Amino acid sequence: ETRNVTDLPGPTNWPLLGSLLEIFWKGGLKKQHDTLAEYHKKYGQIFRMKLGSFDSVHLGSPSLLEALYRTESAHPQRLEIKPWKAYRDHRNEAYGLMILEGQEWQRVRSAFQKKLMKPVEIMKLDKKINEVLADFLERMDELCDERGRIPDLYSELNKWSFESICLVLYEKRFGLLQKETEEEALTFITAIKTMMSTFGKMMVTPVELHKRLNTKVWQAHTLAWDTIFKSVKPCIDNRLQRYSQQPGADFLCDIYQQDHLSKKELYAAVTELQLAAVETTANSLMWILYNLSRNPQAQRRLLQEVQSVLPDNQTPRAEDLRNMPYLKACLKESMRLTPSVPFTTRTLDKPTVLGEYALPKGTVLTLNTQVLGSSEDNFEDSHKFRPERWLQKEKKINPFAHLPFGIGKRMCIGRRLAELQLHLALCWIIQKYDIVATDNEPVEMLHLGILVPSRELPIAFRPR
Ligand code: HEM
Ligand SMILES: C[C@H](CCC(=O)NCCC[N+](C)(C)CCCS(=O)(=O)[O-])[C@H]1CC[C@H]2[C@@H]3[C@H](O)C[C@@H]4C[C@H](O)CC[C@]4(C)[C@H]3C[C@H](O)[C@]12C
């Protein structure tokens, strides 16, 4: 009928360190995802692992993630991010979607979800997205060197992503793409960087103690968040004021006027939207550009579609995407082979059976969403970039085999907007450029928050 947590297989619990010893000898935390995939190959779909006192059970199969979904809490919960909450408490700001829990989370989630995860409303953003892409492409052919290579492509892809989502979120152009207008968002963006490189140092050492002792990390983290909030508020206020007498004209006013979220609540929620959006979206664009340079046949099949559905250099539109099944399949394939987010996390709020294992309340689960990419039950030749696998109707790919955006009600809220931006960015890029590999040397995926390349990506942009 049922076995329990103790009967779970898994790696040796080495004295004091647990699997931390193995990780420090297998590449470090940067390579953690390679190690977890190795473990799922050894012990199968479900296993138990300790990293110091950090004890977790890993789920690495489509059936397990289906089971977890069918039985999930009405308010699913990830691992707590203490430093962000400590800052909000200290400064009396609201929590956003990433740190909210319970009915408080559901309230904000519903309100935003009806705007963000509605195709009809999302497609309305395309004009804005195209305005930013137009500018980005213009900047691209300025940055391209002699042989079509863009120095620090990741950084530039981030500039686009930032500018794109800020137009969507704040109806403003921050001017990341035109030089001379570069030093406007400068302090805002540096504050984001400072914040990102600092909150991680307060997750082992308790944030309460950093606060009590008034450490330099606590100080830097507080200043960085202050600056982020001080930059966001006026934008949201101006947008709120602009449409205060036009119900139905703006997703943000409607939320404010009809769902009754306070301005304080909107500051936190919009802020977390932006933080979640920027790097991950740029990261995904990057990986697809890399997969394209490595698969000229797939890139050719893609070029044909773009040129077929958009003769001349016709500005892409959201409605055109309906007739580009291959474009959309390239993105899915890229996210399966080279995902941005390697895993997510859940704390169980009630006893539940997964596999033939009964897991108690309080069990921390890591959903290895990456490892799903290599299961031969769903992907024959899983090490091959083949977008075709998504288009053939003579074999079902099980939806719980492909989860780059997580699962269930607490899954990524930005899915449609991210897809829309990526789809259109691909149209603009391929339309103008051939994506060529500049070398054939090894490139590795490092876990640095998200999965990033081990080095500058060997790709060039050759004006077609
Ligand atoms: C291509 C880039 C994207 C990737 C792969 C992606 C991936 C994810 C994943 C894996 C999670 C966790 C889901 C879970 O635990 O089940 C997540 C949540 C989140 N994402 Fe995205 N992300 C994308 C872009 C976006 C964008 C465009 C936004 C903002 C519009 C966004 C905002 C959110 C927020 C706020 C959460 C938390 C939702 C909640 O707790 O209720 N992401 N992202
Ligand atoms: C990607 C970012 C930031 C990571 C980071 O520390 N960023 C600095 C990197 C510096 N680099 C030099 C590597 C590159 C800079 C390029 S730049 O163009 O700025 O020059 C990190 C920080 C907070 C992270 C989210 C939260 O946990 C909550 C949630 C948990 C789930 O489990 C997975 C999903 C989710 C939404 C997470 C996604 C992602 O993981 C986020 C956005």
How far does CA 41 lie from the centroid of its chain?
Answer: 26
126 CB burial (10 A radius; 0-12, 13-18, 19+): buried
In short, whether 154's Cβ falls inside 6 Å of ligand 2 is: yes
User: Residue 116 in contact with residue 122, Cβ under 8 Å?
Assistant: yes
Within 6 A (CB) of ligand 1 lie: 78, 97-98, 109, 272-273, 276-277, 280-281, 284, 340-341, 344, 404-407, 410-414, 417-418
Rounded to 5 degrees, φ, ψ at 112 are: -80, -35
In short, whether 158's Cβ falls inside 6 Å of ligand 2 is: yes
**Dihedral angle, C-alpha 27, 32, 34, 38, nearest 10 °:** 110
Residues contacting 84, CB < 8 A, separation 6+: 95, 98, 99, 199
User: Residue 33 in contact with residue 342, Cβ under 8 Å?
Assistant: yes
Q: Which class would CATH give 1-464?
A: mainly alpha
Nearest to 381 by CA among 443, 333, 325: 333
Rounded to 5 degrees, φ, ψ at 210 are: -55, -45
Q: Around Cβ 283, how many Cβ atoms within 10 Å?
A: 23
Nearest-CA residue for atom 20 of ligand 1:
412
- Distance between CA atoms of 422 and 42, rounded to whole angstroms? 36
User: If you search the block for the tokens 């400068």, which residue do you land on?
Assistant: 186
Ligand 2 centroid distance, CA of 450 (Å): 6
Nearest to 374 by CA among 337, 326, 415: 337
Residues contacting 374, CB < 8 A, separation 6+: 37, 382, 383
Ligand 1 centroid distance, CA of 45 (Å): 25
Q: Around Cβ 414, how many Cβ atoms within 10 Å?
A: 20
> What are the distances in angstroms from CA 133 to CA 195, 202, 215, 414, 422?
28, 37, 42, 19, 10
User: Residue 112 in contact with residue 269, Cβ under 8 Å?
Assistant: yes
User: If you search the block for the tokens 């799903």, which residue do you land on?
Assistant: 372
- Distance between CA atoms of 50 and 19, rounded to whole angstroms? 6
Q: Which of 412, 415, 424 to mutate to test the pocket of ligand 1 (most atoms within 8 A of CB)?
A: 412
Return the domain boundaries, the chain.
1-464
Ligand 2 centroid distance, CA of 279 (Å): 7
Orientation angle between helical segments 153-170 and 126-143, nearest 10 degrees: 150
Pairing relation of β-strands 450-453 and 357-359? unpaired
Q: Which of 69, 413, 420, 426 to mutate to test the pocket of ligand 1 (most atoms within 8 A of CB)?
A: 413
User: Residue 320 in contact with residue 326, Cβ under 8 Å?
Assistant: no
Alpha carbons within 13 angstroms on the beta-carbon side of residue 307 total 11
Ligand 1 centroid distance, CA of 276 (Å): 6
The two tokens of residue 231 are 């930059």
User: Residue 14 in contact with residue 47, Cβ under 8 Å?
Assistant: no
Q: Is 436 helix (H, G, I), strand (E, B) or coil?
A: strand
Q: What is the 3-state secondary structure (H, E, C) of 17-86?
A: CECHHHHHHCCCHHHHHHHHHHHHHHHCCEEEEEECCEEEEEECCHHHHHHHHHCCCCCCCCCCCHHHHH
In short, whether 280's Cβ falls inside 6 Å of ligand 2 is: yes
Nearest to 337 by CA among 300, 372, 303: 372
Give 392-413 as a DSSP string. Answer: -TTSPPPGGG--TT--STTS-S
- Distance between CA atoms of 99 and 81, rounded to whole angstroms? 7
In short, whether 449's Cβ falls inside 6 Å of ligand 2 is: yes
Which ligand is in closest contact with the Cα of 81? 2
The method recorded for this entry reads X-ray
- Distance between CA atoms of 375 and 367, rounded to whole angstroms? 15
- Distance between CA atoms of 211 and 209, rounded to whole angstroms? 5
User: Residue 119 in contact with residue 416, Cβ under 8 Å?
Assistant: yes
Which ligand is in closest contact with the Cα of 80? 2
Is 166 a known ligand-binding residue? no
- Distance between CA atoms of 460 and 438, rounded to whole angstroms? 6
User: If you search the block for the tokens 């740029």, which residue do you land on?
Assistant: 282
Pairing relation of β-strands 54-59 and 445-448? unpaired
